[PDB]
Design a protein around this nucleic acid. Structure first.
Length: 188
RNA sequence: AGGAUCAGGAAUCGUCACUCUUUGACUCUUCAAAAGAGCCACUGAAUCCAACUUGGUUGAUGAGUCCCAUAACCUUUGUACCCAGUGAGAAACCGUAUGGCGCGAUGAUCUACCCAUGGGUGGGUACAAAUGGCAGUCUGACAAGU
């Protein structure tokens, strides 16, 4: 967590798991290794420090861990794909209540940042998802996939609104919340 | 002339310890919670299960010996008492001119009921005694160290 203000407030984040809220013990080597290297990042500071607000898509893991930005430490919930694919892109809700997780098999899970519970598991893509977003009002959510599809869904509602077919498969998705556009890189 | 405000009456010490009491601080701590200058990291310690080790039913641990089972409190059977004390009252002559145990204070005299001063029953008080009551002969599987 580098600080562009002051070079000494730059601090390395913790990787120390919270003691698991279930009680049955967690899965990992006792030689505790670091988390595998990350391919995607996601953070909204709307409700910071009341729960987790950093989602990181680690290398070749079926889930993606959550972190408190304020506590400089990986938080309590890990967020799965639930279709046995890799997490290949993540983004979070601007209300700080949802993290969106896009599989390599196309399933987009909407986990909650409250209890680590899932909300909905969308299935539109049969290729990999490669970039997700939500609009700034948390009304209409987009996703770009490795199928060449950009899917328009509502978030309050549950209907697939639109389905734009682009030419090459779509590698990434950047959204502008203030102006409701969204950009994408493709293989073209 | 008697009393109370601002000569009829002991109190001039360069301290050493000791003890006691007193209150205050204090690490804490119950009433009883509640609030937490918050997060990381490093490093230390401690505890608890798993683990392993050593010892252990040839007995690990747990344990009110002494407050006396060596008893207390009774209960029944053999004795000592008293409603030790009482204290002046108990029985009628004399070996060979003469001599005495012939009582007794220095002790004579006795040891709530019925029966003509013969015997005992009843209660308190004490002890000896119980193979009598009250009053029915321990646990047994982990422990301990990292």
């Amino acid at each position: 967590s580098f600080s562009l203000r002051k070079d000494a407030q730059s601090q390395e984040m913790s990787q120390r798991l919270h003691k698991k809220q279930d009680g049955g013990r967690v899965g990992g080597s006792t030689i505790k290794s670091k988390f595998p290297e990350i391919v995607a990042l996601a953070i909204e500071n709307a409700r910071i420090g009341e729960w987790e607000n950093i989602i990181t898509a680690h290398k070749d893991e079926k889930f993606a861990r959550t972190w408190d930005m304020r506590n400089k430490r990986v938080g309590r919930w890990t967020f799965d794909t639930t279709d046995d694919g890799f997490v290949k892109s993540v983004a979070m809700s601007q209300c700080g209540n949802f993290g969106f997780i896009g599989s390599s098999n196309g399933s987009i899970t909407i986990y909650n940042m409250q209890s680590g519970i899932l909300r909905k598991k969308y299935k539109l893509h049969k290729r990999a998802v490669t970039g997700i977003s939500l609009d700034g009002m948390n009304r209409k959510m987009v996703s770009c996939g490795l199928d060449g599809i950009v899917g328009f869904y509502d978030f309050n509602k549950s209907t697939l609104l639109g389905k734009l077919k682009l030419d090459a498969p779509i590698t990434a998705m950047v959204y502008h919340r203030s102006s409701d556009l969204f950009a994408l890189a493709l293989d073209d």
